């Protein structure tokens, strides 16, 4: 039993090719998912490019996916064949200090391991995941496939920012997969939301439909400072802008896609203004349930740009960088 | 100089009468306000009715008002004649533990004294208040006059409820002045908002327009339980309903208009479900600024019913008890 | 195929019932629409009440709706499955004197027939309409569903009033579906706009956000006369209070919802002041395109009160007459 | 009795000198105005330069002014000493075909004579004008002085263009005195307004505050064609670049300041697209009242660059041609 998959034997986008792979089988506590849609994210790009080591090798990437349960492993209850599911992408033990306080993405036993990085991922017709990671959903699976990275990372960022109604929130990288949900969550929490894009002219309507009160270029954002919160899911790419626009008590919530991100930090400005720089990665297992429910209720929206077949995975990854891309790129195995 | 005012020398609606009164004059730290609109609230009704002691006597009630600065007291700066203002209604010292942590409504020195209860109030052409209590505003003053009690009290309740996006929030008394802002603030903070009214057949749509996701009768609320949060500004009037629909970790935020309110509390159900019963009164001075800005920005809505002249203050207080429709009743001196 | 619909076999609101009905099939020149939102208007109420004879019987009402094309009939091009559309509600031939001069609502061949009155309408999951009546739009369909009656009728009234910048325009019934757009169009054309409402305090803020320069009661309008234009979408309801506020050269533009509208006209005042009484119904097909584009550009606004499910259509229609209501009621099949 | 005035005995700005002149006295039907502010316009520049013959000689120019009535001649009513007034600048008889149909700027008896061209004008402490040309105003006279030429010419252009809401209007010379009001009036009538300027980068924010939806260079406007209306107050200066941007039924409204303005017109393109080329000069006496009321109401705005004393009249005239001028130059005698 074979399946189609995109895999690399050595890092580099040039090495990501369509192959035939043995179809995996679920053991105890696991489910086999027929992948319907997989998200295309900076994280997946950087994994393929070798920013971090993947296992196993040769490696199928794809850390964000949704699909239909094909086979439940032994002992598995609560999910059966035919169930549409979307996959929480962190392996977690459920028994360590981090898991027991809800921070499952920080699990001490698995090391925070990400499905599709330390296991084979969703750029394939089938994938095996822990049954407790598969969340049943009534949402359209194209839309649900924007949740495990894009929406959940943005939720976790906004949660860790302590946004109060009235507060001015700048979202850097607001056109990106995480950023566009960060606009939505910051507005859902009561923020006055300023979405930052160099493409303001072209993307203004999309970002306002996501809840932005204003769409500013980076240079316009500097004139609109100060901000109470900056949500910046781009690593170090915009550090100078993000840090400088914060006011007293400002919170800079930082997330990234695992590229190197060393920056110059002025501690004196940080302590003089009582700024907090707040790291965020992934999201809590409980919050993933909340995000799925918000999507089902129409309270958040999935902004989609294009869907590619598996054979076009290289083209899909390169589309991340296209100036005409506004919204999510998906793979349909 | 003399002015027109509504005053009572002894309690009872029957004894509230339009009189001539000496126009007050502002001392150090004070401003004289030409009152443009004053709200008609249960608190004012209960003050006139004698359920709470007022001073001085004979007494001019009116704890919620907006107007134009007529005269600034000796030394007063930052507030000028002609400025339109809306009045924070708690006297606060700024130096005690409560004031210094931001809980100005809990001031240990003034005892939380409410303007128009321990001072002469706004049911008069002119009122004297502390200059630090007068907030300049560009909002229409009829809408501003809904903020000092209705909006601020609701803001404070929702703030004290720790509403997280996705949580199920029930608002009891949702058709009242506080309750209709509580609907708005629960939605502003990300709650899934269920407005509860015996009068759902008549008020469903107006409450949806305030932000409710659904409107339920009490019996429907019991069927839709559990709720994560109940916001109940009606004192003890719906205690059994509000307490019994809470689920695990539920927060019941309670506020009222100073009438007697003893209830039967089952501590075993409270601790078995880890419920919190949370008292709320007034609001923080800082939060009053935020509420004013939110109204000026159009992020919250003033639901108004009718404006009465001062000579019809008794008909205005009766309209509060038996309303032709939902919304704030105002007096215009 | 069967669909859910609200239908009546005999007039009366109590006879309007949820039924299963045969899903219609589009014939030549027609499209099948999956209705997303349908407006609730006085006209729909009067159809259900029997003030207006409807065909066929039993009858599915609903003359204002927007949705997504499901199927194109034989010979149809320019429109395909998936297209969001909003429906011009007048049947027109395109070849008569009226159609060829642009007055498609006055078509001599169809007799002006109104979709949902002489055809089955939009209070159902699906509806068939002429392909040339379906306008593709990128607007939110909830907002687009306010255009076929409310906005278009108001546009046609304002267009027929010859409003010049500076002219004083009174809008009666200004909070109704048509009236609230008539405020907007009178301001868009340069008029000085006085919205007339006896509920002044309740509705002043929404009417100012619609473009009113002032909100007056009917008695204040009498004191503020003369006006150059009255826009009256209320049939005969406001005539006796309003005709007398017009000055020399004044234009009284009348529209309505097909109930009886007999009034007494003082002809000597009419000719002595060179007043014009101008009938207005529906709107021109070309102007419907303009109105759609204005909504897409954010130059006009939909003011929404509540959306009901199809099962609650009776409550939706009764809400039309509610004292609590301000703004548009929609049905979502 | 003597006054200061700027007068020229021979054409050329270098010959416009401050002199001591006999203060005029008002005859029957005339008022003496103490000039407070006089506009500096291309027309005034071209009168001084000799492109337009003036009388009497030596000549006091200045065709656009506002001031205070100092003295009423015999038979003046409805205009009294002390009244702030702004002056309609066309002499008109009130009894010819043109005056009796409203086109007072086309008066057959006076020949369209312009105050300050065929009479001594407002670049002096005092000027005599017909009482019926003086309009009392409560607006600031510095802003009123922008109306007799700049605003009224723009009004008459936009009126003659039959602008309908939604129509695309290009304004050439949008930074000029007429053009900046043409932007406002085109927007006031509901047009989608594109302001054309080679100095786009520096004037963008000002033209947007005047109502422009976009600010384009001439070459950018070619790419945005077709337009329904071009408003061109610059004579022949922009014709070759602008006539071709018009679409079907387009209207090209032309005004100017009396210099040579011969152009090449392709009649075949004109009749093939049913284009109209529409001459506009001055404005109607009735429309001047409307424009004054619109300024008093804040519906139009005076955009001012600088005010100069009468001694600096030569600097003020040359500032018309400065690349750094954005807005009106005034003289204050
Ligand atoms: Cl991205
Ligand atoms: Cl209506
Ligand atoms: Cl100019
Ligand atoms: Zn763990
Ligand atoms: Zn204190
Ligand atoms: Zn026809
Ligand atoms: Zn004449």
Numbering used by the authors:
A (entry chain D), B (entry chain A), C (entry chain C), D (entry chain B): -1 to 331
Share the article's original sentences.
For these studies, we substituted the PyAeADHII enzyme-bound Zn2+ with cobalt and measured the spectral properties of the enzyme in solution, we obtained the crystal structure of both wild-type (PyAeADHII-WT) and cobalt-bound (PyAeADHII-Co) at 1.75 Å and 2.2 Å resolution, respectively, and determined the co-crystal structure of the NADPH-bound form (PyAeADHII-NADPH) of the enzyme at 2.35Å resolution. Four molecules of ADH were found in the asymmetric unit with each monomer containing its own structural Zn2+. To confirm that the metal-binding sites in the wild-type enzyme were complexed to Zn2+, a low energy remote data set was collected using the same crystal at λ = 1.2480 Å. The structural studies show strict homology to other mesophilic ADHs despite the high thermostability and the lack of a catalytic Zn2+ ion. PyAeADHII contains 19 proline residues of which 14 reside in coil/loop regions of the protein. Notably, the proline residues in PyAeADHII, TBADH and HADH are distributed throughout the protein whereas in YADH, the prolines are localized in the N-terminal and central regions of the protein.
In the present work, our attention was focused on a thermostable ADH from the hyperthermophilic archaeon Pyrobaculum aerophilum (PyAeADHII). This ADH is characterized as belonging to the medium-chain dehydrogenase/reductase (MDR) superfamily, with a size of 330 residues and a structural Zn2+ binding site made up of four closely spaced cysteine residues localized in a lobe at the periphery of the catalytic domain. However, previous studies have revealed that PyAeADHII has peculiar characteristics because the enzyme lacked activity on most standard compounds used to test the activity of ADHs, and was active only when α-tetralone was used as a substrate. PyAeADHII, possessing only the structural Zn2+ site, may be a hybrid between Zn2+-dependent medium-chain ADHs and non- Zn2+ dependent SDRs.
